[PDB]
Amino acid sequence: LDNGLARTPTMGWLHWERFMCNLDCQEEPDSCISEKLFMEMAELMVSEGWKDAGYEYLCIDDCWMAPQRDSEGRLQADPQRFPHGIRQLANYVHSKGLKLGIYADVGNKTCAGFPGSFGYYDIDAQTFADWGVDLLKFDGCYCDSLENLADGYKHMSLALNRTGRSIVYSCEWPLYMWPFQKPNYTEIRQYCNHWRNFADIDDSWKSIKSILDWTSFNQERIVDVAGPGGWNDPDMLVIGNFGLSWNQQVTQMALWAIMAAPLFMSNDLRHISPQAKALLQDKDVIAINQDPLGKQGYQLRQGDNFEVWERPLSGLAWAVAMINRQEIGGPRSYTIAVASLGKGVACNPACFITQLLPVKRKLGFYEWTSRLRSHINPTGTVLLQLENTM
Amino acid sequence: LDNGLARTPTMGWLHWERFMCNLDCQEEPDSCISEKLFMEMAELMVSEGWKDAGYEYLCIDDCWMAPQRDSEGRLQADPQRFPHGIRQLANYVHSKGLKLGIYADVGNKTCAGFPGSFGYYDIDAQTFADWGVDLLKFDGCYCDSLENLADGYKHMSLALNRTGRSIVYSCEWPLYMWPFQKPNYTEIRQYCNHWRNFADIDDSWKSIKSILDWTSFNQERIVDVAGPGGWNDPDMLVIGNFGLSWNQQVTQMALWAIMAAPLFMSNDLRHISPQAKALLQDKDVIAINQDPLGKQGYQLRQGDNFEVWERPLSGLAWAVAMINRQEIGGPRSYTIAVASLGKGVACNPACFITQLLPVKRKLGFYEWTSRLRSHINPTGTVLLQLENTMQM
Ligand SMILES: *[C@@H]1O[C@H](CO)[C@@H](O[C@@H]2O[C@H](CO)[C@@H](O[C@@H]3O[C@H](CO)[C@@H](O)[C@H](O[C@H]4O[C@H](CO)[C@@H](O)[C@H](O)[C@@H]4O)[C@@H]3O)[C@H](O)[C@H]2NC(C)=O)[C@H](O)[C@H]1NC(C)=O
Ligand SMILES: *[C@@H]1O[C@H](CO)[C@@H](O[C@@H]2O[C@H](CO)[C@@H](O)[C@H](O)[C@H]2NC(C)=O)[C@H](O)[C@H]1NC(C)=O
Ligand SMILES: *[C@@H]1O[C@H](CO)[C@@H](O[C@@H]2O[C@H](CO)[C@@H](O)[C@H](O)[C@H]2NC(C)=O)[C@H](O)[C@H]1NC(C)=O
Ligand SMILES: *[C@@H]1O[C@H](CO)[C@@H](O)[C@H](O)[C@H]1NC(C)=O
Ligand SMILES: *[C@@H]1O[C@H](CO)[C@@H](O)[C@H](O)[C@H]1NC(C)=O
Ligand SMILES: NC[C@H]1N[C@H](CO)[C@H](O)[C@@H]1O
Ligand SMILES: NC[C@H]1N[C@H](CO)[C@H](O)[C@@H]1O
């Protein structure tokens, strides 16, 4: 989408995975989907260094709406859970230097059953712009035809444009097309700043494996379309929650950097371990994810329960990730000729290699003839940056 | 097995899950199966508090043997990886106050392809006894006849008996029966101190779930068989390795306590986080696992992606574990009438409830009519101890 936005993958926080559709503010005031939850997350995004690290968009997912539209047929936030309304929440979020994301659905209802936007695309776009919304996640539930799906996503894209406000447009279009018809990613990128390709992530290593495996299986179709203004979205970062071991969290961070993925955390910023916070705020890894060239990485190799992924960066640098998919035993040795990396240019005539994950360690100079040797933890990842000596 | 051993579930360390069959001591010296590894592991078991916590058996799994038997037809340790031999390793282990476990196979070869014990049961038992072995893990590979399997396990049990040395006898008999017919656990318990029921564990939450689900599915068949001298073995503790989140590690520790399981760690004691070590050395949870009553726990309830397990303890106490199997979202509230716990006996007329996991916290007195309310993390477990009481 050539709206001047998302020139690097969008970074921020999205409530869905950790907080979902919790409406029980009477029994669970601190966890329910409410204005107070987003105020608390905004405060911590400022005070705990998230904004400084680049996490900029505080995003509302499903279950913010009132059961019905208002007198004039516009969407409204739930009166009890969002007493001051979305425009006021956006004002607050802006006063902190952050941006606000909101959620709507292309069909007749949202996935959780709240008012859909079909028939209201232009009014909804104008409502969002009037409210000061900075990002829209547009879901695909309750849409009875591929034509309605495509037409709605394009119509909403154009309506957002017509409001004149800069609004990041996040689409689930491909995900809802894939069971029936192969998506045309050139068209999608024409209309969207990023697009969900695959099933919702949850708090599990199985989910991560399945997302990585889908991305590597389909990489010939999706890798080259990505770039400044339009990214593949493999769904939220779930680092800092409950289901991932430390090495599995490292794998998610490293490979979301390799994939030039949007970095939408879905966690509780009020209760997050120092280790998870340091991983999610890792300057060098974020810098890889945010590389201005915006060329998505890809899987280079797979075999012996090892995977090698790599990503070209600005200024002749490369990022390389090595995953150990064997879920038994101990750290496993993996070696690869550096001439096999970076299409044969990264280390010609030589390169300096720095390991970034699981810990930052300079590895030294590697000549064109050299072999890179590493030990990779089960379900963990070794992430490296290669700098050509020219 | 009525050998006076394993009156509580055996506790120790077994190399299989973490170190497997790594034979490459030149390229992977720190991971290969060698005498130096077991010597160092013994030193750390002493110095890092593992022996004090109750972990007593340092156990060798597969891939310790030389490719062939010796001139006298007895087994021998690998010449390069175990130059000083099993007798000397056992001397070292005993000098640290620990006990040594070893591995053999009922069939013609071990699962990794090394000499099997079939045809040599009595001499192999005697060899182990001469070496000073204190525990035998007896595998079931390369034995495709049910009669051979059963006869071999019984024979090895009797042969170990004849040596006159006290040796814990750990069997994989039931697991190897399933391709043919489901086991008679009365017979197995007659011959074994504990027995593997289900597929090998690996370093994953998937594996933990599958072991728990098999145990609860088959619990009417295996729970009452267990007791002092004979335990169900759901395989090694893998806390301290790589594939389990903190809450998944807590779930494994809590439920291995519930199940009266042998506690065999399979990790690297040289590289283990403080948090994992504190969990594995948790005095109160170990005390649940080691409860002298020796009655295995069971799944009480299951529904809405929640599980409730409980285990009766000595002196009218109970352990209760609540698992959240929903792998999305945040901590989920679960409430239960305390009268539903411990068969209505734990809290009659009252009980004092102490949460032990994920953190230790006194919850207070709960009267027989009261309700217990708790919050459980995704893939985590809340482990509680109920003490029957007449007071407030
Ligand atoms: C080879 O097999 C034989 C037969 O199975 C086995 O002999 C058995 O040894 C056990 C353990 O020593 C004996 O059990 C003991 O019996 C005495 C006398 O009745 C009791 O006083 C003992 O009670 C104490 O220990 C128990 C734990 O075992 C506790 O439950 C109890 O509270 C006491 O602390 C204990 O019951 C058993 O009687 C014999 N059986 C026979 C038939 O002789 C022998 O040990 C095996 N070989 C080797 C090397 O162990
Ligand atoms: C509406 O769409 C137009 C057309 O794509 C966008 O115009 C582009 O804006 C970028 C950034 O300002 C320029 O670099 C391009 O040259 C423009 N292209 C064209 C064809 O005009 C415009 O930014 C969009 N406006 C909003 C508010 O989204
Ligand atoms: C995928 O969609 C793109 C964009 O809608 C199609 O490309 C356009 O094709 C028309 C007609 O040939 C050209 O005039 C435009 O210049 C193209 N637009 C762009 C942005 O390239 C493309 O044909 C579609 N591909 C398939 C296989 O259907
Ligand atoms: C919404 O419902 C109407 C009436 O049932 C239907 O005609 C229309 O196609 C639906 N729209 C979508 C996108 O499913
Ligand atoms: C199980 O084994 C015991 C002891 O050997 C024996 O007495 C019993 O009959 C067996 N049960 C069945 C059902 O075969
Ligand atoms: N992919 C389906 C989408 N619908 C849910 C909201 O109800 C989340 O936004 C999820 O990402
Ligand atoms: N269940 C199969 C058994 N065989 C392996 C050794 O090769 C492990 O001991 C495992 O416990």
Author numbering:
A (entry chain A): 32 to 421
B (entry chain B): 32 to 423
Task: Please give the exact wording used by the authors of the publication that reports this structure.
α-Galactosidase A (α-Gal A, EC 3.2.1.22) is a lysosomal glycosidase that hydrolyzes the terminal α-linked galactoside present on macromolecules such as globotriaosylceramide (Gb3).1,2 Mutations in the α-galactosidase A gene (GLA) are found in patients with Fabry disease (FD), one of the most common lysosomal storage diseases (LSDs), which is characterized by the progressive accumulation of Gb3 in cells. To unravel the binding mechanism of iminosugars with α-Gal A, N-methylated derivatives 20–24 were synthesized, and we determined the crystal structures of α-Gal A in complex with compounds 4 and 5 at pH 7.2 and 4.5, respectively, and 8, 20, 21, 23, and 24 at pH 7.2 at 1.97 to 2.61 Å resolution.2,32 The structures revealed that these pyrrolidines bind to the catalytic site nearly in the center of the TIM-barrel domain of the enzyme. The bindings are primarily stabilized not only by hydrogen bonds (H-bonds) between the hydroxyl groups of the compounds and the residues D92, D93, L168, D170, E203, R227, and D231 of α-Gal A but also by a salt bridge between the endocyclic amino group (endo-N) of the monobasic compounds (pKa ∼ 7.0) and D170 of the enzyme at pH 7.2.
Previously, the dibasic iminosugar and potent α-Gal A inhibitor 5 having the (2R,3R,4S,5R) configuration pattern demonstrated good chaperoning activity in cells transiently transfected with various mutant α-Gal A.23 Notably, iminosugar 5 exhibited superior pH-dependence in its inhibitory activity compared to its monobasic parent molecule, 4, suggesting that it binds to α-Gal A at pH 7.0 more effectively than 4, leading to better enzyme-stabilizing or chaperoning activity. Surprisingly, in the compound 5-bound structure of α-Gal A, the positively charged exocyclic amino group (exo-N, pKa = 9.1) of 5 forms bifurcated salt bridges (BSBs) with residues E203 and D231 of the enzyme at pH 7.2, where the carboxylic side chains are essentially deprotonated and negatively charged. By contrast, the corresponding C-2 hydroxyl group of 4 forms H-bonds alone to E203 and D231 at pH 7.2. This finding most likely reflects the stronger binding affinity and better protecting effects of 5 toward α-Gal A at pH 7.2 compared to those of 4. In contrast, the titration curves revealed that the endo-N moiety in compound 5 exhibits reduced basicity (pKa = 5.5) compared to that of 4 (pKa = 7.0) due to electrostatic repulsion between the vicinal ammonium cations,34 which implies the formation of an H-bond between endo-N of 5 and D170 at pH 7.0 but a salt bridge at pH 4.5. Given these structural findings, it is conceivable that the pH-dependent protonation states on the amino groups of iminosugars and ionizable residues in the catalytic site of α-Gal A regulate the binding status of the compounds, i.e., the stronger binding of 5 to α-Gal A at pH 7.2 is due to the formation of the BSBs, which are missing at pH 4.5 when the binding is weaker and only H-bonds are formed.
